[PDB]
Write a protein that binds this DNA or RNA. Structure first.
Length: 78
RNA sequence: UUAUCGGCGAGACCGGGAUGCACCUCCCGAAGGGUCU
């Protein structure tokens, strides 16, 4: 049982005037409220199952599925 | 692929002391000699 863990990382480069124009008051740039709201650091955590192998059964062409699973950008999960 | 999206990140000397040294003979024997203006 491991948690697939996705976090917004608003680095200093992201939080810089070189990348956008924050609204200014007193000449100070209004810092982004990352603690919550529509502009928060989304800490999305999902359950995930970490087994050493995955398995499926299927009635299909072995060549095409081998090629797809080896070369197509497809994984197992959400 | 039961949906759609999300860098985890930022800072730090690990360093400071030490002799490894103190004792031993490797020696003991022999003819390389004889053939051709």
């Amino acid at each position: 049982a491991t948690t697939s863990m996705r976090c917004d990382y608003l680095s200093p480069e992201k939080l810089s005037t070189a990348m956008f124009s924050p609204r200014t008051r007193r000449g100070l740039f209004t810092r982004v409220l990352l603690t919550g709201g529509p502009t928060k650091r989304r800490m999305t955590t999902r359950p995930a199952y970490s087994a050493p192998y995955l398995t499926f059964d299927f009635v299909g062409s072995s060549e095409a599925v081998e090629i797809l699973l080896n070369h197509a950008h497809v994984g197992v999960g959400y």
